[PDB]
């Protein structure tokens, strides 16, 4: 139960902050869970998604066994776009399908020194 008197259960205020959150908040909004072997190997539950993460889509029109790489992250639309996931238009031109990153299982991350520092903070805070 909510006990702080400085945080809202208010629906209008939560939706207002959600749909008008700045980009550094929208990165935390667009966080994705990890695969079970990678969370066993790293001891972390979820990570924010970036440009070059490998993605297995778990739900929607495409489900499972389609481990592809993301290409674009519209934080304005809360939508990542995946290279494998396609849909043709009327004129035979392909276009990427909108997939929300909460319905996304990351299979492999992108290695970086900054992500090693983030992973170390995640592991130390999970303790």
């Amino acid at each position: 139960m909510k006990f702080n008197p400085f945080v809202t259960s208010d629906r209008s205020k939560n939706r207002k902050r959600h749909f008008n959150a700045p980009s550094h908040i929208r990165r935390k909004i667009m966080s994705s869970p990890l695969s079970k072997e990678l969370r066993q190997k790293y001891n972390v539950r979820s990570m924010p998604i970036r440009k070059d993460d490998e993605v297995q889509v778990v739900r929607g029109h495409y489900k499972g066994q389609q481990i592809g790489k993301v290409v674009q992250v519209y934080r304005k639309k809360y939508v990542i776009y995946i290279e494998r996931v396609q849909r043709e238009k009327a004129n035979g031109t392909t276009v990427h399908v909108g997939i929300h990153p909460s319905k996304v299982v990351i299979t492999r991350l992108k290695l970086d020194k900054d992500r090693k520092k983030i992973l170390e903070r995640k592991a130390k805070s999970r303790q």
Binding site: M1, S9, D10, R11
Partner: protein, 260 residues
Amino acid sequence: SELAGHQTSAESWGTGRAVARIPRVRGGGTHRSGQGAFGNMCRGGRMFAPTKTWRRWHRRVNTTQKRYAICSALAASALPALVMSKGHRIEEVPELPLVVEDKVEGYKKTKEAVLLLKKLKAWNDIKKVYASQRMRAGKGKMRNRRRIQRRGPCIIYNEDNGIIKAFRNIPGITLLNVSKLNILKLAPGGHVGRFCIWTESAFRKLDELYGTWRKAASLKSNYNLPMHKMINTDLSRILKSPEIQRALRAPRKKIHRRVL
């Protein structure tokens, strides 16, 4: 409202320009200029009796009636038919009002709390609350109340030593104290007979806190238990007693219908 639809300065036409006698906003160009001004029957006007902030909201009750309602609710919580007719699952539950040991109030986790409810068979009453946690009907969903979550048991204790932590997030449960008994928690909705789970110190402190008809309350100042209107009130036993049936006329069961 507190600053009504009287922001528009307006006058009435009168006899000529014979639309109506309602005040009309005055201007031009804007197509509102000429429409209905303040008044109860107009667009954008003023509501009938704008509900002021000094309504008589809060209602004082006599403290003797408050304590009378607490005593009535606690007495109705003891009869099994009343609480079964309120709807709690008391099938596999042991003896009425349940008195647990004083090791219960020193719980720290909630797994022991759930295991205690499963062993004392209140977990069926918790499972009813799990089965009914649906969405609010009507327009009440907008003001942050979207859960019809029916009330389950209420555990009444003293000497808070982690029991609020053990019973804080169980669905339908009620945190409630002996020294601070709430009518709104003991009888929600005005319907008496809620399933309550006591403790040893709670069930012993009740007599210290209210008394009997022989002694007064030793914790409160000037409270006694109220005098009962009927001493022995089994009406079927009274009507089948030999003293009453010794002094009756005769059972007259003829009908004597209309004769054509």
